Write a protein that holds these residues in place. Structure first.
Motif, PDB file in Angstrom:
ATOM      1  N   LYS A   9       0.824  -1.202   0.000  1.00 53.92           N
ATOM      2  CA  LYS A   9       0.000   0.000   0.000  1.00 53.92           C
ATOM      3  C   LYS A   9       0.859   1.253   0.000  1.00 53.92           C
ATOM      4  CE  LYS A   9      -3.932   0.181   0.303  1.00 53.92           C
ATOM      5  NZ  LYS A   9      -4.975   0.241  -0.758  1.00 53.92           N
ATOM      6  N   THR A  10       2.000   1.210   0.676  1.00 55.05           N
ATOM      7  CA  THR A  10       2.885   2.360   0.760  1.00 55.05           C
ATOM      8  C   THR A  10       3.896   2.411  -0.375  1.00 55.05           C
ATOM      9  OG1 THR A  10       4.371   1.174   2.256  1.00 55.05           O
ATOM     10  CG2 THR A  10       2.586   2.460   3.230  1.00 55.05           C
ATOM     11  N   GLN A  37      -1.213   8.742   3.837  1.00 55.01           N
ATOM     12  CA  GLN A  37      -0.327   7.765   3.228  1.00 55.01           C
ATOM     13  C   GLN A  37      -0.902   7.162   1.960  1.00 55.01           C
ATOM     14  OE1 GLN A  37       0.561   4.874   6.191  1.00 55.01           O
ATOM     15  NE2 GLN A  37       1.864   6.246   7.402  1.00 55.01           N
ATOM     16  N   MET A  38      -1.944   7.758   1.398  1.00 53.86           N
ATOM     17  CA  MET A  38      -2.536   7.224   0.184  1.00 53.86           C
ATOM     18  C   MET A  38      -1.808   7.765  -1.037  1.00 53.86           C
ATOM     19  SD  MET A  38      -4.776   5.127   1.112  1.00 53.86           S
ATOM     20  CE  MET A  38      -5.720   4.831  -0.379  1.00 53.86           C
ATOM     21  N   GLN A  77      -4.319   5.625  -5.599  1.00 50.19           N
ATOM     22  CA  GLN A  77      -5.004   4.748  -4.658  1.00 50.19           C
ATOM     23  C   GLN A  77      -6.165   5.457  -3.976  1.00 50.19           C
ATOM     24  OE1 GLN A  77      -2.079   3.363  -1.934  1.00 50.19           O
ATOM     25  NE2 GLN A  77      -1.196   1.839  -3.326  1.00 50.19           N
ATOM     26  N   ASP A 131     -10.938   1.694  -2.475  1.00 48.90           N
ATOM     27  CA  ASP A 131     -10.355   1.092  -1.280  1.00 48.90           C
ATOM     28  C   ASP A 131     -10.686   1.882  -0.024  1.00 48.90           C
ATOM     29  OD1 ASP A 131      -9.176  -1.029  -2.656  1.00 48.90           O
ATOM     30  OD2 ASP A 131      -7.334   0.097  -3.044  1.00 48.90           O
TER      31      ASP A 131
END
Lengths: 49, 49
Positions: free
Chosen positions: A10-11, B34-35, B39, B44
């Motif tokens: 995800k990061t 942190q996206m 994303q 999500d």
């Protein structure tokens, strides 16, 4: 770990790892037949009711 | 909250009030930080609405 690899994907971080990608596609195409003279013998019956 | 009592003991009175509520779920606004910008567009999050 299957929990731990969720975080690093995800990061955006690349783990020491690789992939191949496999997928299947279907195409609708036109065709051309050819057959020389007596290519097949054909027997038909008598119909029922 | 309104500032109750003297501020010399403000934060120590704070954490005892909220010791459960901080850890029941995830804070919304921090996790958006942190996206990846692609994303975030994805479903999500489910906080786009």
């Amino acid at each position: 770990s299957p929990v731990a690899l969720h975080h690093q994907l995800k990061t955006g971080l690349h783990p020491g790892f690789g992939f191949t990608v496999v997928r299947q596609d279907r195409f609708v195409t036109e065709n051309v037949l050819f057959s020389e003279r007596a290519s097949e013998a054909y027997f038909l019956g008598q119909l029922q009711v | 909250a309104a500032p109750a009592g003297p501020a010399a003991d403000m934060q120590q009175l704070f954490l005892n009030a909220w010791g459960q509520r901080l850890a029941h779920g995830r804070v919304r606004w921090v996790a958006e930080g942190q996206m990846t910008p692609e994303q975030f567009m994805q479903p999500d999050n489910a906080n786009l609405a």
